[PDB]
Symmetry: C6
Subunit: 304 residues, 6 copies
């Protein structure tokens, strides 16, 4: 919905967003939204995500797909009215994204999802990319395990010529939806076949906000393989604007750079990670500051 502000209420919001990343307990936002979700009347639509065609499928709090749901309206304090309807397994009325308010007045945040090795990581979408010899898949799994901490991370596999890999987009968004509804740390191995159908474009622009609102983190590998400048710019835009955080490889093998967005219009943070391989290619992240647009852009041209 829309929000109204004066100098004072804006200063307050800025303070709360700052706290959502820097001082709240890591993973607390996820626990809070998990509660809001379990307070939902059973069978009520809580999330809608676009399929290949541009249509959306809808799920309930138990990650069950709702095939039918008679029209229902809800007027928010905003004055606006939200209407949801599901016919034959597809949304007839409503919108993509969360169909229940998980944030209230706490919007534009980057809820800390976890702390590891002395650094706080943001919820939302993290794109792992870069050129060079550092492997993306091993890094995505090591980050998944690290941010998970005491919790197991969820792995969504898509579009790789390996055994058991799903290659159907519609199954992919269904896997993604279920993961976000049930797990704080999510790994997506291969955004590649996504980088185009209306569904893929929707996913690219919707997932980061979906995750940030839930307080969960989605870690997706994006190999900028092609040298075709039209998708190169797409990968770069995804890395710059549809991602809450960016993890990109450097000149030095095994070393990565993390760029974190801490809130709407706030400064981006940056830090470096060292990594190494153990048996069967299992990678470990070793544990042993603000950046301006100038810096941001320099990192981005690495994609060229």
């Amino acid at each position: 919905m829309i929000h109204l502000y004066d100098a004072k209420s804006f200063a307050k919001l800025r303070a709360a967003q700052y706290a959502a990343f820097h001082t709240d307990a890591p993973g607390s936002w996820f626990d809070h939204t998990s509660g809001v979700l379990e307070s939902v009347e059973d069978g009520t639509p809580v999330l809608a995500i676009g399929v290949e065609s541009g249509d959306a499928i809808v799920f309930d709090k138990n990650a069950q797909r709702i095939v039918a749901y008679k029209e229902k309206s809800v007027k928010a304090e905003d004055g606006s009215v939200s209407v949801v309807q599901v016919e034959n397994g597809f949304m007839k009325q409503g919108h993509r994204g969360w169909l229940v308010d998980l944030t209230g007045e706490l919007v534009g945040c980057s809820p800390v999802v976890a702390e590891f090795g002395g650094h706080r990581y943001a919820s939302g979408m993290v794109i792992v990319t870069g050129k060079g010899n550092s492997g993306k898949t091993p890094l995505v799994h090591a980050l998944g395990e690290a941010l998970g901490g005491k919790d197991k991370y969820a792995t969504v596999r898509f579009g790789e010529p390996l055994s058991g890999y799903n290659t159907d987009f519609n199954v992919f968004v269904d896997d993604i939806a279920r993961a976000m509804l049930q797990h704080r740390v999510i790994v997506i191995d291969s955004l590649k076949n996504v980088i185009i159908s209306r569904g893929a474009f929707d996913l690219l622009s919707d997932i980061g906000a979906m995750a940030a609102s839930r307080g969960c983190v989605v870690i997706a590998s994006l190999n900028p393989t092609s040298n075709d400048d039209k998708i190169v710019e797409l990968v770069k835009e995804a890395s710059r604007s549809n991602s809450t955080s960016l993890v990109i490889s450097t000149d030095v093998d095994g070393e990565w750079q993390v760029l974190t967005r801490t809130g709407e219009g706030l400064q981006r943070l940056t830090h470096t990670l060292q990594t190494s391989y153990g048996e069967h290619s299992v990678l470990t992240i070793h544990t042993s500051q603000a950046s301006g647009k100038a810096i941001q852009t320099v990192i981005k041209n690495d994609e060229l």
Copy 2:
């Protein structure tokens, strides 16, 4: 509608447009249009805006979406006839934009929306853009607060991978319509995912006139990230022709240039703004001339 002129009535029109920006009390046009809107019969369609498909959703004077409205025709002074009809929540007959006359013979104006720091600001659409390190988001919010003055400003959030951000275009236009019907100062944070569906193209060409007719101001951040010459020219065209005013960053951090259109075919005004950050990135605009097309173009190439 169309208007007829001879030298004398054209001169009177030019004098009136001049006063609409330079001498009318700031924000008085907004108060005037609020009265016109309130004098509308309850349930009568006053505003139509396009959704993603290119279809239009319609609202009444109370920012409530009209789903059913029997065909009704009105013949204007012009002799032309306006016909409106709404079926199943969508405009069957009519046009995008204001469905009631908010202007009469006072057309082609840039109704002054507010005065701040000794400068008059126009209603209509303001695009905040530019390259460099000066942040756009902090600026749109500071400008929203400053032009709001005694009034709170409305914030429409769209397409950012942050908590509570809507990413569905159809919800976005619903938020925009309601904001313009109820508030004089609006902030749109992120025109990014707009820069393409028919709905997005409609918004870009419709919003400035909608707002200028209402006497409200829509301050939209537009980060010219991509270097893909096709959207680059789209961003530049938007900044040059679809905006009533332009606020662009300079070589010096914290400093901005404001290019204001004062009326149809009138000269543009320019002035500079100095700004600084305080706690939690809250930005403040400090407060302590005509330009030609050549100057205009020079600023525009900053976009490259």
Copy 3:
């Protein structure tokens, strides 16, 4: 329809086309077609113009839109048959343009619409463009007033982020049709949003011929802003081939050059105008030869 000719009937035609521009009384063609129109049976469709989709809306002699009209055919001398039918407000049978013959055997002319400052001006479509500091809007209004002479000119406003400006294409062509049905001097302030839907392409291809047939003149500002070669070439094409006359700015502020097509197969004329500003930006045109395609192409490259 088609016309048959031999050396003699061809010479007569060229003599008559020459007269239509060079010796006929200014604005006499418009008075004549006004006569043809008014002598039409009430309700008879007289003009069809394309809407956005490519469909056409139809008007009667009083600029009223015909929503229903039973199929009716007419056989001309040509032997050809014209069939017109209107269903649910849209043309089911017929063609875009004038539905009644306003020309007969007198075709291929640029009927003189007015004489001002010692120069004869042609009816049809005039595109006012060019790069530089010379203002397009002040110029079209000044031309409208001057060619209007004793008569007021009609102003059609479209696609500008200013008050009261319509931005819906379908309302635009309805405005245009009515203006041509009722006035000899018409100004369109902004073909910009036209420069693409089938309706827009249709308008660019139809308007010039429509106006010339009626003996009215349509003066349209076309700011060649974008540097995107695809539309830049569209602006040139429109300026070169869809315009009966071209008024383009020069290196000297306030100075313009006029290129006039005087008839089918005839030479273009050229003359220069000096102008100056008075109060509130009201512009005045001061009063106080054939060209070859070489000259014409040179002017055209000013668009680059």
Copy 4:
């Protein structure tokens, strides 16, 4: 249909094609097909041409449009079967082009349409083009009158911002069809708006064969105005492959070069024309050899 040949029957065909251009009486083929057309049962479809959409309208021998025609089949000696059906003014079964055999075994000819100034001219389509100052419209009309000889030529006007000019493609193909059915010499002023809908593409590839089969000549002006390499190649392809003859301007004003195709796979002929203007821009062609592909290509790059 298909044709079978052995060395002897092929040599015979080659001899007949040679005679169709070089020795038959000018215009005799037209008279022959005129007879074949008048021997057609009244109301039977003889010609089908594509409209904008890609559908085709059909005419009878009197250039009357057939709106209904119950399915009918005809087996040619080829063994093949030709079926024609017209429903609601549109061909339901059949093909574009002549629906009655006008040629028999005499195919691949370039029937001499006329002789003038010591040169034989071919039927089919002639495209008049080129850069420079020589005017296309005056030349098309002078050629029309010259080839007409004792007969008047038919003029089809399309897409020019002049009085009485039709701008609707569907009316244009109807004018073209009628002209080919009733006249040996046809002039089309402006193929411009054709150079894209399926109808325009069809016309470009169909007209030359339509005319060549009838023994009529279609003279169309094609101004290679745009510098957009995609249509430049289109104009060049039209001039090279969809035209039976090409008339192109040279470095010297008033001088033209004619390139004539004399038959399928035969050598092209070339000659030069001198011209001059009389009163009201009436142009006269003064009256007082084989070329290879090398030569052909050189002429074609003139279009660049």
Copy 5:
């Protein structure tokens, strides 16, 4: 269908493919397939070819178009099932290409179609192309006569602005289907208007296999006129991969190079042809080795 192999059956297949070109009696495969076709039940669909839309028309063994055919299924040795159905003149079920097995286990061959001047020529599609002064049309006809030998060759004429030339794609495929069903040597004069609808793309990828399976040869002229790199690469791909053989012009007038594919994955053969003109441009081919991919590519760039 699919075929299984071990070293031994693969060796036998390679030996059989070798003999299909090098040792079988010229044109014997065509005689063989004629017998297979004649043994088909009357009315049974034997061949389907695509029309412009991408739909397919179907024929019986007597080159008669089938408009109605009740669904019928046949299970091949492969285990697969072929189902055919024809409704309202169009294939409802089935596939493009031969609907009956003309090959059995003899697949991947280039059945020798004829021997002339001491050289064996393959069935399938032959594209005649190249730049320079050597004429394509005279060559396809001379080759049609030479490979026909004791038999007349079939000529399918398409898309040339000459008398009796069909320009409708749907008639073109009907002519092609019938020719291949009834004649061993076919000449297609003009693949030009093909080089795009789904039907045209289908023809390019289907014709070579259709003909090679029948044992017939289709000699198509392809004039690489345009310099538009996109169709240039299309012409080159057609010449390289969609043709069983390629006949291309050299630097010397009248001299051609013949590149023949002898089987799947086998080596290509090359030989040179000298030619000369006689009366009325009738060309005669005078009669008085393996190449590598490098040579292959060299010839191909001649197309640039």
Copy 6:
């Protein structure tokens, strides 16, 4: 489905994926999945593959196409639900790929399909490409025979102008499905006509995963002929990301290099092959290390 992991379950998975390629008995995965398939209830849909339009056809365990199958759902451990329904021969509900779980928790593997000449080869999709004089076709057949070992390999022929070659995409995917359902070693001779319809894009994205899941290998020749950068990049992408293994030619005729993906997140292996020709072009592979992305990219540019 999705899988949850912590450090320990992840290490086990990587150990198992390593084993699937490095130590499991060659071809044992295929025997295992053959077991899963045969234990499926007759009639149960087991595999869905896309046809040209983007729709999917479905097969049972016996490679028979299912035309009708009433909606049936199944809930996996994942909690997710799989729903399959087939109407009129097409999948109404379900997804492309395997409709029955062939992998369970064992995902992301490249199951060893065979061992030949001291090298283990992976199941999944192998693309055989490269520039130069080394023949693709002889190589795929030689690999098919070698990896076949004691078993015959299945050959799927598509898009070549030779006898018996199918050129219809829908028959192609039916051939492919049947081959994977019934054979461990499969060769596709020509993905060329695939490199675009939704079906083609689907195939390129699905086949590798399908084959790897089954434990079968699909060897496809892909001749990178065109120099059109758009498809050149499509060939690289397919070679880089849609292939489980890549076999590409070198500077030395007869010599190839093999790049094998050994598992999800694992390193690629590389080895070189020498080959030679025997009778009738039958090729023999002679029998007698990890790579980094740098190495991999260098190989890829050989495509340019």
